[PDB]
Amino acid sequence: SISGTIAVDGSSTVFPISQAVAEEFEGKFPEVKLTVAMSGTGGGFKKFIAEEIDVTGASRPITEKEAAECKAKGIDYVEFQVAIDGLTVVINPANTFAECMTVAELNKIWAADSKVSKWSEVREGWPDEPIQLFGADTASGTFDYFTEVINGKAKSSRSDYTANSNDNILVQGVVDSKGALGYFGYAYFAENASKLKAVKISDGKKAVCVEPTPATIESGEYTPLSRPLFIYTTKAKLKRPEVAEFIKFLLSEKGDQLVEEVKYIKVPKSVKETMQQRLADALK
């Protein structure tokens, strides 16, 4: 006998996990109603701190300031790492000059105020040829992630590019244009790897020309375009068995399968073990 309402909010990037787990969970437990909102990571934490929701999805860890606001209110948050989100920047395989690019160069191309139209304008000496841009639809999770880490918190980009919700169409776009530059989730690169070239990414810090692979994503070397995703709730909310049951399913092998189903990367076994043990502690 499991029942009640669970209010979930948070990141556009955690939304697909929360919605998918909800749809599955609701079937398995018909007396549970899940409402899933998408206020953003910060927006979700704001409602979390205001105690207006039960669970919040975050595309980054809770901040020191958010954590302090939580503690001040007696809120005992529990953090669960639930997936890894990786994005690939791709070029046409015939492109041999842009094999490694910097975040700064990607920003030069994609920024809200960028008028860049030619490769020669990105880096000295590159061909005087048009860059044909492909990317995610506005305000999709992929868009939100790419723009956040490439352009900044303003979470915007130029709008003059070929945008599509269907990543298979973006793949074909890159295949068909020698001068293409595109971005989309790693899963769509991986399954088309023989037809696409993934750009190696430098971040000006510790990441120098890092190729996106399962190894570099799992080790955290591929930054900023891969990152862990989180679900937060509180110790008090976990006393409600429907909330506890929701987290349990999320961390289970079935949860991992759903994570992959929505095209994310499931967490390493060491992460899974830790999160399960963490849930067990929170229930005491």
Side-chain angles (χ1 to χ4, degrees), residues 3-10 15 18 22 25-26 32-39 44 47-48 51-57 231-234 237 240 242-243 246-247:
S3 73
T5 307
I6 310 170
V8 185
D9 202 335
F15 189 82
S18 296
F25 192 83
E26 283 195 348
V32 192
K33 187 174 74 100
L34 281 291
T35 61
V36 187
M38 205 181 74
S39 299
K47 299 209 185 183
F48 193 71
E51 297 191 281
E52 295 159 348
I53 59 175
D54 301 322
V55 171
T56 195
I231 282 281
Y232 286 83
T233 188
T234 79
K237 300 279 186 179
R240 293 166 40 189
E242 77 273 13
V243 171
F246 178 70
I247 298 297

PDB file of all heavy atoms in Angstrom, residues 3-10 15 18 22 25-26 32-39 44 47-48 51-57 231-234 237 240 242-243 246-247:
ATOM      1  N   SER A   3       0.920   5.308  -1.374  1.00  0.00           N
ATOM      2  CA  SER A   3       0.017   6.361  -1.844  1.00  0.00           C
ATOM      3  C   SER A   3       0.485   7.786  -1.538  1.00  0.00           C
ATOM      4  O   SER A   3       1.382   7.997  -0.722  1.00  0.00           O
ATOM      5  CB  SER A   3      -1.373   6.160  -1.243  1.00  0.00           C
ATOM      6  OG  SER A   3      -1.377   6.496   0.134  1.00  0.00           O
ATOM      7  N   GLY A   4      -0.142   8.758  -2.194  1.00  0.00           N
ATOM      8  CA  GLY A   4       0.125  10.160  -1.924  1.00  0.00           C
ATOM      9  C   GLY A   4       0.622  10.961  -3.114  1.00  0.00           C
ATOM     10  O   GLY A   4       0.793  10.432  -4.214  1.00  0.00           O
ATOM     11  N   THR A   5       0.854  12.249  -2.886  1.00  0.00           N
ATOM     12  CA  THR A   5       1.360  13.139  -3.921  1.00  0.00           C
ATOM     13  C   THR A   5       2.831  13.455  -3.682  1.00  0.00           C
ATOM     14  O   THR A   5       3.233  13.764  -2.560  1.00  0.00           O
ATOM     15  CB  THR A   5       0.571  14.460  -3.956  1.00  0.00           C
ATOM     16  OG1 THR A   5      -0.828  14.178  -4.067  1.00  0.00           O
ATOM     17  CG2 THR A   5       1.011  15.323  -5.134  1.00  0.00           C
ATOM     18  N   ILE A   6       3.626  13.366  -4.745  1.00  0.00           N
ATOM     19  CA  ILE A   6       5.026  13.766  -4.709  1.00  0.00           C
ATOM     20  C   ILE A   6       5.212  14.936  -5.667  1.00  0.00           C
ATOM     21  O   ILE A   6       4.943  14.814  -6.861  1.00  0.00           O
ATOM     22  CB  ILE A   6       5.948  12.610  -5.132  1.00  0.00           C
ATOM     23  CG1 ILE A   6       5.602  11.335  -4.363  1.00  0.00           C
ATOM     24  CG2 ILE A   6       7.414  12.973  -4.912  1.00  0.00           C
ATOM     25  CD1 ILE A   6       6.304  10.101  -4.892  1.00  0.00           C
ATOM     26  N   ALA A   7       5.646  16.076  -5.140  1.00  0.00           N
ATOM     27  CA  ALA A   7       5.918  17.241  -5.973  1.00  0.00           C
ATOM     28  C   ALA A   7       7.387  17.258  -6.375  1.00  0.00           C
ATOM     29  O   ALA A   7       8.255  17.455  -5.525  1.00  0.00           O
ATOM     30  CB  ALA A   7       5.561  18.519  -5.227  1.00  0.00           C
ATOM     31  N   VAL A   8       7.658  17.054  -7.668  1.00  0.00           N
ATOM     32  CA  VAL A   8       9.019  17.066  -8.207  1.00  0.00           C
ATOM     33  C   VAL A   8       9.207  18.318  -9.060  1.00  0.00           C
ATOM     34  O   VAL A   8       8.296  18.719  -9.783  1.00  0.00           O
ATOM     35  CB  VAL A   8       9.288  15.820  -9.090  1.00  0.00           C
ATOM     36  CG1 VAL A   8      10.752  15.775  -9.548  1.00  0.00           C
ATOM     37  CG2 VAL A   8       8.941  14.554  -8.332  1.00  0.00           C
ATOM     38  N   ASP A   9      10.380  18.936  -8.975  1.00  0.00           N
ATOM     39  CA  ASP A   9      10.679  20.117  -9.773  1.00  0.00           C
ATOM     40  C   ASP A   9      12.147  20.031 -10.125  1.00  0.00           C
ATOM     41  O   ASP A   9      12.790  19.030  -9.823  1.00  0.00           O
ATOM     42  CB  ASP A   9      10.378  21.389  -8.968  1.00  0.00           C
ATOM     43  CG  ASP A   9      10.152  22.604  -9.847  1.00  0.00           C
ATOM     44  OD1 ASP A   9      10.664  22.623 -10.983  1.00  0.00           O
ATOM     45  OD2 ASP A   9       9.463  23.545  -9.394  1.00  0.00           O
ATOM     46  N   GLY A  10      12.679  21.061 -10.769  1.00  0.00           N
ATOM     47  CA  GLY A  10      14.104  21.113 -11.013  1.00  0.00           C
ATOM     48  C   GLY A  10      14.502  21.382 -12.449  1.00  0.00           C
ATOM     49  O   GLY A  10      13.750  21.983 -13.223  1.00  0.00           O
ATOM     50  N   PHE A  15      14.528  16.733 -15.781  1.00  0.00           N
ATOM     51  CA  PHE A  15      13.115  16.546 -16.160  1.00  0.00           C
ATOM     52  C   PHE A  15      12.806  15.233 -16.908  1.00  0.00           C
ATOM     53  O   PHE A  15      11.864  14.535 -16.534  1.00  0.00           O
ATOM     54  CB  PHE A  15      12.604  17.759 -16.969  1.00  0.00           C
ATOM     55  CG  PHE A  15      11.110  17.772 -17.213  1.00  0.00           C
ATOM     56  CD1 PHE A  15      10.242  18.233 -16.243  1.00  0.00           C
ATOM     57  CD2 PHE A  15      10.588  17.383 -18.434  1.00  0.00           C
ATOM     58  CE1 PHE A  15       8.866  18.275 -16.473  1.00  0.00           C
ATOM     59  CE2 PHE A  15       9.214  17.421 -18.670  1.00  0.00           C
ATOM     60  CZ  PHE A  15       8.355  17.864 -17.682  1.00  0.00           C
ATOM     61  N   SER A  18      12.995  12.411 -14.366  1.00  0.00           N
ATOM     62  CA  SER A  18      11.878  12.518 -13.432  1.00  0.00           C
ATOM     63  C   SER A  18      10.542  12.146 -14.078  1.00  0.00           C
ATOM     64  O   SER A  18       9.723  11.467 -13.461  1.00  0.00           O
ATOM     65  CB  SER A  18      11.794  13.927 -12.836  1.00  0.00           C
ATOM     66  OG  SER A  18      12.946  14.211 -12.068  1.00  0.00           O
ATOM     67  N   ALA A  22       8.611   8.795 -13.245  1.00  0.00           N
ATOM     68  CA  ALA A  22       7.239   9.034 -12.783  1.00  0.00           C
ATOM     69  C   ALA A  22       6.206   8.179 -13.517  1.00  0.00           C
ATOM     70  O   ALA A  22       5.364   7.542 -12.884  1.00  0.00           O
ATOM     71  CB  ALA A  22       6.873  10.505 -12.896  1.00  0.00           C
ATOM     72  N   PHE A  25       6.754   4.649 -12.462  1.00  0.00           N
ATOM     73  CA  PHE A  25       6.424   4.545 -11.043  1.00  0.00           C
ATOM     74  C   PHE A  25       4.918   4.625 -10.806  1.00  0.00           C
ATOM     75  O   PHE A  25       4.372   3.853 -10.018  1.00  0.00           O
ATOM     76  CB  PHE A  25       7.141   5.649 -10.262  1.00  0.00           C
ATOM     77  CG  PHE A  25       7.115   5.470  -8.777  1.00  0.00           C
ATOM     78  CD1 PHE A  25       8.036   4.647  -8.149  1.00  0.00           C
ATOM     79  CD2 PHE A  25       6.192   6.152  -8.001  1.00  0.00           C
ATOM     80  CE1 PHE A  25       8.021   4.488  -6.773  1.00  0.00           C
ATOM     81  CE2 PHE A  25       6.170   5.998  -6.623  1.00  0.00           C
ATOM     82  CZ  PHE A  25       7.085   5.166  -6.009  1.00  0.00           C
ATOM     83  N   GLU A  26       4.254   5.561 -11.483  1.00  0.00           N
ATOM     84  CA  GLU A  26       2.804   5.735 -11.356  1.00  0.00           C
ATOM     85  C   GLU A  26       2.034   4.502 -11.801  1.00  0.00           C
ATOM     86  O   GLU A  26       0.997   4.175 -11.230  1.00  0.00           O
ATOM     87  CB  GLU A  26       2.317   6.959 -12.146  1.00  0.00           C
ATOM     88  CG  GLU A  26       2.586   8.295 -11.474  1.00  0.00           C
ATOM     89  CD  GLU A  26       1.797   9.438 -12.092  1.00  0.00           C
ATOM     90  OE1 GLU A  26       1.222   9.249 -13.185  1.00  0.00           O
ATOM     91  OE2 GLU A  26       1.747  10.525 -11.478  1.00  0.00           O
ATOM     92  N   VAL A  32      -0.265   6.769  -6.274  1.00  0.00           N
ATOM     93  CA  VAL A  32       0.722   7.829  -6.155  1.00  0.00           C
ATOM     94  C   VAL A  32       0.588   8.782  -7.332  1.00  0.00           C
ATOM     95  O   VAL A  32       0.607   8.359  -8.490  1.00  0.00           O
ATOM     96  CB  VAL A  32       2.148   7.265  -6.147  1.00  0.00           C
ATOM     97  CG1 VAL A  32       3.139   8.342  -5.741  1.00  0.00           C
ATOM     98  CG2 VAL A  32       2.227   6.101  -5.199  1.00  0.00           C
ATOM     99  N   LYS A  33       0.443  10.070  -7.035  1.00  0.00           N
ATOM    100  CA  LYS A  33       0.405  11.079  -8.087  1.00  0.00           C
ATOM    101  C   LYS A  33       1.692  11.890  -8.083  1.00  0.00           C
ATOM    102  O   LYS A  33       2.059  12.489  -7.071  1.00  0.00           O
ATOM    103  CB  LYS A  33      -0.806  12.006  -7.930  1.00  0.00           C
ATOM    104  CG  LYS A  33      -0.993  12.980  -9.094  1.00  0.00           C
ATOM    105  CD  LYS A  33      -2.294  13.778  -8.961  1.00  0.00           C
ATOM    106  CE  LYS A  33      -2.206  14.850  -7.872  1.00  0.00           C
ATOM    107  NZ  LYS A  33      -1.932  16.215  -8.421  1.00  0.00           N
ATOM    108  N   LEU A  34       2.378  11.887  -9.221  1.00  0.00           N
ATOM    109  CA  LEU A  34       3.599  12.658  -9.397  1.00  0.00           C
ATOM    110  C   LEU A  34       3.290  13.887 -10.239  1.00  0.00           C
ATOM    111  O   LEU A  34       2.736  13.775 -11.331  1.00  0.00           O
ATOM    112  CB  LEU A  34       4.665  11.827 -10.115  1.00  0.00           C
ATOM    113  CG  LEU A  34       5.511  10.774  -9.390  1.00  0.00           C
ATOM    114  CD1 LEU A  34       6.463  11.425  -8.418  1.00  0.00           C
ATOM    115  CD2 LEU A  34       4.659   9.741  -8.688  1.00  0.00           C
ATOM    116  N   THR A  35       3.629  15.063  -9.721  1.00  0.00           N
ATOM    117  CA  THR A  35       3.627  16.268 -10.538  1.00  0.00           C
ATOM    118  C   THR A  35       5.078  16.645 -10.784  1.00  0.00           C
ATOM    119  O   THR A  35       5.860  16.771  -9.841  1.00  0.00           O
ATOM    120  CB  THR A  35       2.883  17.437  -9.866  1.00  0.00           C
ATOM    121  OG1 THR A  35       3.523  17.773  -8.630  1.00  0.00           O
ATOM    122  CG2 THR A  35       1.438  17.059  -9.595  1.00  0.00           C
ATOM    123  N   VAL A  36       5.445  16.802 -12.049  1.00  0.00           N
ATOM    124  CA  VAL A  36       6.825  17.121 -12.384  1.00  0.00           C
ATOM    125  C   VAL A  36       6.893  18.480 -13.057  1.00  0.00           C
ATOM    126  O   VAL A  36       6.329  18.675 -14.135  1.00  0.00           O
ATOM    127  CB  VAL A  36       7.465  16.059 -13.308  1.00  0.00           C
ATOM    128  CG1 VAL A  36       8.942  16.342 -13.483  1.00  0.00           C
ATOM    129  CG2 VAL A  36       7.272  14.668 -12.741  1.00  0.00           C
ATOM    130  N   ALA A  37       7.588  19.413 -12.417  1.00  0.00           N
ATOM    131  CA  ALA A  37       7.728  20.758 -12.951  1.00  0.00           C
ATOM    132  C   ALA A  37       9.157  20.970 -13.399  1.00  0.00           C
ATOM    133  O   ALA A  37      10.026  20.127 -13.168  1.00  0.00           O
ATOM    134  CB  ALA A  37       7.347  21.785 -11.905  1.00  0.00           C
ATOM    135  N   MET A  38       9.410  22.123 -14.007  1.00  0.00           N
ATOM    136  CA  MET A  38      10.705  22.383 -14.610  1.00  0.00           C
ATOM    137  C   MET A  38      11.165  23.813 -14.371  1.00  0.00           C
ATOM    138  O   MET A  38      11.408  24.560 -15.316  1.00  0.00           O
ATOM    139  CB  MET A  38      10.613  22.109 -16.110  1.00  0.00           C
ATOM    140  CG  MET A  38      11.928  21.771 -16.744  1.00  0.00           C
ATOM    141  SD  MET A  38      11.635  21.491 -18.651  1.00  0.00           S
ATOM    142  CE  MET A  38      11.410  23.341 -19.126  1.00  0.00           C
ATOM    143  N   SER A  39      11.280  24.188 -13.100  1.00  0.00           N
ATOM    144  CA  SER A  39      11.631  25.554 -12.724  1.00  0.00           C
ATOM    145  C   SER A  39      13.098  25.894 -12.958  1.00  0.00           C
ATOM    146  O   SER A  39      13.487  27.059 -12.882  1.00  0.00           O
ATOM    147  CB  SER A  39      11.279  25.802 -11.256  1.00  0.00           C
ATOM    148  OG  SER A  39       9.891  25.630 -11.062  1.00  0.00           O
ATOM    149  N   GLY A  44      14.310  25.421  -8.958  1.00  0.00           N
ATOM    150  CA  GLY A  44      13.902  24.274  -8.170  1.00  0.00           C
ATOM    151  C   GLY A  44      14.417  24.336  -6.740  1.00  0.00           C
ATOM    152  O   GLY A  44      13.703  24.010  -5.799  1.00  0.00           O
ATOM    153  N   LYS A  47      12.331  26.787  -4.632  1.00  0.00           N
ATOM    154  CA  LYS A  47      11.102  26.194  -4.127  1.00  0.00           C
ATOM    155  C   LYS A  47      11.397  25.145  -3.067  1.00  0.00           C
ATOM    156  O   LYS A  47      10.607  24.928  -2.155  1.00  0.00           O
ATOM    157  CB  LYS A  47      10.288  25.578  -5.267  1.00  0.00           C
ATOM    158  CG  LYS A  47       9.857  26.569  -6.336  1.00  0.00           C
ATOM    159  CD  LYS A  47       8.549  26.134  -6.985  1.00  0.00           C
ATOM    160  CE  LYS A  47       8.160  27.045  -8.138  1.00  0.00           C
ATOM    161  NZ  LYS A  47       6.838  26.669  -8.721  1.00  0.00           N
ATOM    162  N   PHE A  48      12.542  24.489  -3.207  1.00  0.00           N
ATOM    163  CA  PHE A  48      13.016  23.506  -2.244  1.00  0.00           C
ATOM    164  C   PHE A  48      13.249  24.186  -0.905  1.00  0.00           C
ATOM    165  O   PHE A  48      12.808  23.705   0.132  1.00  0.00           O
ATOM    166  CB  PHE A  48      14.326  22.912  -2.760  1.00  0.00           C
ATOM    167  CG  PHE A  48      14.783  21.673  -2.029  1.00  0.00           C
ATOM    168  CD1 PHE A  48      14.105  20.472  -2.172  1.00  0.00           C
ATOM    169  CD2 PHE A  48      15.918  21.704  -1.233  1.00  0.00           C
ATOM    170  CE1 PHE A  48      14.547  19.323  -1.524  1.00  0.00           C
ATOM    171  CE2 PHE A  48      16.367  20.558  -0.580  1.00  0.00           C
ATOM    172  CZ  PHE A  48      15.679  19.366  -0.727  1.00  0.00           C
ATOM    173  N   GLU A  51      10.245  25.238   0.774  1.00  0.00           N
ATOM    174  CA  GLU A  51       9.504  24.052   1.212  1.00  0.00           C
ATOM    175  C   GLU A  51       8.169  23.880   0.498  1.00  0.00           C
ATOM    176  O   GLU A  51       7.166  23.518   1.112  1.00  0.00           O
ATOM    177  CB  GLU A  51       9.314  24.058   2.731  1.00  0.00           C
ATOM    178  CG  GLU A  51      10.631  24.004   3.493  1.00  0.00           C
ATOM    179  CD  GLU A  51      10.447  23.747   4.974  1.00  0.00           C
ATOM    180  OE1 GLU A  51      10.111  24.698   5.712  1.00  0.00           O
ATOM    181  OE2 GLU A  51      10.638  22.586   5.398  1.00  0.00           O
ATOM    182  N   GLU A  52       8.173  24.127  -0.807  1.00  0.00           N
ATOM    183  CA  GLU A  52       6.965  24.043  -1.615  1.00  0.00           C
ATOM    184  C   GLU A  52       6.974  22.817  -2.530  1.00  0.00           C
ATOM    185  O   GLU A  52       6.023  22.588  -3.278  1.00  0.00           O
ATOM    186  CB  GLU A  52       6.784  25.335  -2.424  1.00  0.00           C
ATOM    187  CG  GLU A  52       6.526  26.567  -1.551  1.00  0.00           C
ATOM    188  CD  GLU A  52       6.850  27.879  -2.250  1.00  0.00           C
ATOM    189  OE1 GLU A  52       7.490  27.847  -3.329  1.00  0.00           O
ATOM    190  OE2 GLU A  52       6.478  28.943  -1.706  1.00  0.00           O
ATOM    191  N   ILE A  53       8.054  22.038  -2.461  1.00  0.00           N
ATOM    192  CA  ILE A  53       8.190  20.791  -3.223  1.00  0.00           C
ATOM    193  C   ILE A  53       8.868  19.688  -2.388  1.00  0.00           C
ATOM    194  O   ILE A  53       9.419  19.962  -1.323  1.00  0.00           O
ATOM    195  CB  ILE A  53       8.986  20.996  -4.537  1.00  0.00           C
ATOM    196  CG1 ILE A  53      10.391  21.523  -4.244  1.00  0.00           C
ATOM    197  CG2 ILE A  53       8.242  21.935  -5.491  1.00  0.00           C
ATOM    198  CD1 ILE A  53      11.265  21.642  -5.482  1.00  0.00           C
ATOM    199  N   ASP A  54       8.844  18.453  -2.886  1.00  0.00           N
ATOM    200  CA  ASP A  54       9.401  17.311  -2.150  1.00  0.00           C
ATOM    201  C   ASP A  54      10.760  16.870  -2.675  1.00  0.00           C
ATOM    202  O   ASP A  54      11.623  16.431  -1.915  1.00  0.00           O
ATOM    203  CB  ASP A  54       8.454  16.116  -2.238  1.00  0.00           C
ATOM    204  CG  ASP A  54       7.087  16.420  -1.681  1.00  0.00           C
ATOM    205  OD1 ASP A  54       7.010  17.139  -0.666  1.00  0.00           O
ATOM    206  OD2 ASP A  54       6.093  15.944  -2.267  1.00  0.00           O
ATOM    207  N   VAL A  55      10.927  16.972  -3.987  1.00  0.00           N
ATOM    208  CA  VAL A  55      12.110  16.466  -4.676  1.00  0.00           C
ATOM    209  C   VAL A  55      12.541  17.475  -5.725  1.00  0.00           C
ATOM    210  O   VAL A  55      11.703  18.015  -6.438  1.00  0.00           O
ATOM    211  CB  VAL A  55      11.795  15.132  -5.394  1.00  0.00           C
ATOM    212  CG1 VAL A  55      12.948  14.709  -6.289  1.00  0.00           C
ATOM    213  CG2 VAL A  55      11.480  14.042  -4.386  1.00  0.00           C
ATOM    214  N   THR A  56      13.839  17.741  -5.830  1.00  0.00           N
ATOM    215  CA  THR A  56      14.295  18.646  -6.875  1.00  0.00           C
ATOM    216  C   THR A  56      15.479  18.077  -7.664  1.00  0.00           C
ATOM    217  O   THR A  56      16.394  17.474  -7.096  1.00  0.00           O
ATOM    218  CB  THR A  56      14.570  20.068  -6.321  1.00  0.00           C
ATOM    219  OG1 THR A  56      14.673  20.996  -7.407  1.00  0.00           O
ATOM    220  CG2 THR A  56      15.834  20.101  -5.474  1.00  0.00           C
ATOM    221  N   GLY A  57      15.421  18.248  -8.980  1.00  0.00           N
ATOM    222  CA  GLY A  57      16.456  17.757  -9.885  1.00  0.00           C
ATOM    223  C   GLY A  57      17.447  18.867 -10.165  1.00  0.00           C
ATOM    224  O   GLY A  57      17.048  20.008 -10.399  1.00  0.00           O
ATOM    225  N   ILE A 231      19.400  14.225  -7.923  1.00  0.00           N
ATOM    226  CA  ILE A 231      18.070  14.365  -7.350  1.00  0.00           C
ATOM    227  C   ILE A 231      18.252  14.626  -5.861  1.00  0.00           C
ATOM    228  O   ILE A 231      19.012  13.923  -5.192  1.00  0.00           O
ATOM    229  CB  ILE A 231      17.241  13.084  -7.564  1.00  0.00           C
ATOM    230  CG1 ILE A 231      16.708  13.032  -8.999  1.00  0.00           C
ATOM    231  CG2 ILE A 231      16.094  12.999  -6.556  1.00  0.00           C
ATOM    232  CD1 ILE A 231      15.481  13.911  -9.242  1.00  0.00           C
ATOM    233  N   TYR A 232      17.572  15.651  -5.347  1.00  0.00           N
ATOM    234  CA  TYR A 232      17.631  16.005  -3.930  1.00  0.00           C
ATOM    235  C   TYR A 232      16.276  15.824  -3.285  1.00  0.00           C
ATOM    236  O   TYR A 232      15.248  16.126  -3.889  1.00  0.00           O
ATOM    237  CB  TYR A 232      18.028  17.475  -3.754  1.00  0.00           C
ATOM    238  CG  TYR A 232      19.480  17.776  -4.020  1.00  0.00           C
ATOM    239  CD1 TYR A 232      19.942  17.986  -5.310  1.00  0.00           C
ATOM    240  CD2 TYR A 232      20.387  17.866  -2.976  1.00  0.00           C
ATOM    241  CE1 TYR A 232      21.273  18.266  -5.553  1.00  0.00           C
ATOM    242  CE2 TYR A 232      21.712  18.150  -3.211  1.00  0.00           C
ATOM    243  CZ  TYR A 232      22.151  18.348  -4.495  1.00  0.00           C
ATOM    244  OH  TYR A 232      23.484  18.623  -4.715  1.00  0.00           O
ATOM    245  N   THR A 233      16.272  15.339  -2.050  1.00  0.00           N
ATOM    246  CA  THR A 233      15.085  15.420  -1.220  1.00  0.00           C
ATOM    247  C   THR A 233      15.582  15.651   0.202  1.00  0.00           C
ATOM    248  O   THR A 233      16.728  16.043   0.387  1.00  0.00           O
ATOM    249  CB  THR A 233      14.197  14.165  -1.352  1.00  0.00           C
ATOM    250  OG1 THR A 233      12.961  14.374  -0.656  1.00  0.00           O
ATOM    251  CG2 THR A 233      14.895  12.945  -0.794  1.00  0.00           C
ATOM    252  N   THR A 234      14.737  15.450   1.203  1.00  0.00           N
ATOM    253  CA  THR A 234      15.168  15.685   2.574  1.00  0.00           C
ATOM    254  C   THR A 234      14.955  14.442   3.420  1.00  0.00           C
ATOM    255  O   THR A 234      14.201  13.550   3.043  1.00  0.00           O
ATOM    256  CB  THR A 234      14.445  16.893   3.206  1.00  0.00           C
ATOM    257  OG1 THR A 234      13.127  16.512   3.615  1.00  0.00           O
ATOM    258  CG2 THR A 234      14.355  18.041   2.218  1.00  0.00           C
ATOM    259  N   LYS A 237      11.267  14.196   4.412  1.00  0.00           N
ATOM    260  CA  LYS A 237      10.384  13.721   3.347  1.00  0.00           C
ATOM    261  C   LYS A 237      10.517  12.218   3.146  1.00  0.00           C
ATOM    262  O   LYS A 237       9.566  11.553   2.747  1.00  0.00           O
ATOM    263  CB  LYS A 237      10.670  14.440   2.026  1.00  0.00           C
ATOM    264  CG  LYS A 237      10.496  15.948   2.051  1.00  0.00           C
ATOM    265  CD  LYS A 237       9.048  16.361   1.912  1.00  0.00           C
ATOM    266  CE  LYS A 237       8.929  17.873   1.793  1.00  0.00           C
ATOM    267  NZ  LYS A 237       7.510  18.293   1.631  1.00  0.00           N
ATOM    268  N   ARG A 240       8.098   9.686   4.565  1.00  0.00           N
ATOM    269  CA  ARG A 240       6.922   9.360   3.765  1.00  0.00           C
ATOM    270  C   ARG A 240       7.311   8.223   2.831  1.00  0.00           C
ATOM    271  O   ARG A 240       8.200   8.383   1.999  1.00  0.00           O
ATOM    272  CB  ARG A 240       6.456  10.580   2.961  1.00  0.00           C
ATOM    273  CG  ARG A 240       5.910  11.730   3.807  1.00  0.00           C
ATOM    274  CD  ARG A 240       5.794  13.014   2.995  1.00  0.00           C
ATOM    275  NE  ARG A 240       5.311  12.758   1.641  1.00  0.00           N
ATOM    276  CZ  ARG A 240       5.288  13.665   0.669  1.00  0.00           C
ATOM    277  NH1 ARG A 240       5.716  14.898   0.900  1.00  0.00           N
ATOM    278  NH2 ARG A 240       4.836  13.335  -0.534  1.00  0.00           N
ATOM    279  N   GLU A 242       6.090   6.837   0.231  1.00  0.00           N
ATOM    280  CA  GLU A 242       5.985   7.042  -1.214  1.00  0.00           C
ATOM    281  C   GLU A 242       7.185   7.825  -1.769  1.00  0.00           C
ATOM    282  O   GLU A 242       7.588   7.639  -2.922  1.00  0.00           O
ATOM    283  CB  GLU A 242       4.658   7.723  -1.588  1.00  0.00           C
ATOM    284  CG  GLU A 242       4.585   9.225  -1.325  1.00  0.00           C
ATOM    285  CD  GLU A 242       4.136   9.559   0.082  1.00  0.00           C
ATOM    286  OE1 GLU A 242       4.109   8.647   0.934  1.00  0.00           O
ATOM    287  OE2 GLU A 242       3.805  10.736   0.340  1.00  0.00           O
ATOM    288  N   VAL A 243       7.756   8.699  -0.945  1.00  0.00           N
ATOM    289  CA  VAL A 243       8.939   9.450  -1.336  1.00  0.00           C
ATOM    290  C   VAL A 243      10.150   8.534  -1.274  1.00  0.00           C
ATOM    291  O   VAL A 243      10.970   8.509  -2.190  1.00  0.00           O
ATOM    292  CB  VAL A 243       9.160  10.671  -0.429  1.00  0.00           C
ATOM    293  CG1 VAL A 243      10.507  11.311  -0.702  1.00  0.00           C
ATOM    294  CG2 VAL A 243       8.034  11.680  -0.623  1.00  0.00           C
ATOM    295  N   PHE A 246      10.080   6.175  -4.091  1.00  0.00           N
ATOM    296  CA  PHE A 246      10.424   6.825  -5.347  1.00  0.00           C
ATOM    297  C   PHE A 246      11.935   6.884  -5.555  1.00  0.00           C
ATOM    298  O   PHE A 246      12.427   6.660  -6.661  1.00  0.00           O
ATOM    299  CB  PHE A 246       9.832   8.232  -5.425  1.00  0.00           C
ATOM    300  CG  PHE A 246      10.204   8.971  -6.679  1.00  0.00           C
ATOM    301  CD1 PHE A 246       9.693   8.578  -7.906  1.00  0.00           C
ATOM    302  CD2 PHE A 246      11.064  10.058  -6.636  1.00  0.00           C
ATOM    303  CE1 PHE A 246      10.036   9.254  -9.070  1.00  0.00           C
ATOM    304  CE2 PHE A 246      11.411  10.739  -7.796  1.00  0.00           C
ATOM    305  CZ  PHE A 246      10.891  10.336  -9.014  1.00  0.00           C
ATOM    306  N   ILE A 247      12.668   7.198  -4.492  1.00  0.00           N
ATOM    307  CA  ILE A 247      14.122   7.267  -4.581  1.00  0.00           C
ATOM    308  C   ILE A 247      14.717   5.879  -4.807  1.00  0.00           C
ATOM    309  O   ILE A 247      15.638   5.716  -5.604  1.00  0.00           O
ATOM    310  CB  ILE A 247      14.753   7.919  -3.330  1.00  0.00           C
ATOM    311  CG1 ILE A 247      14.270   9.363  -3.182  1.00  0.00           C
ATOM    312  CG2 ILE A 247      16.272   7.886  -3.423  1.00  0.00           C
ATOM    313  CD1 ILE A 247      14.686  10.268  -4.322  1.00  0.00           C
TER     314      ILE A 247
END
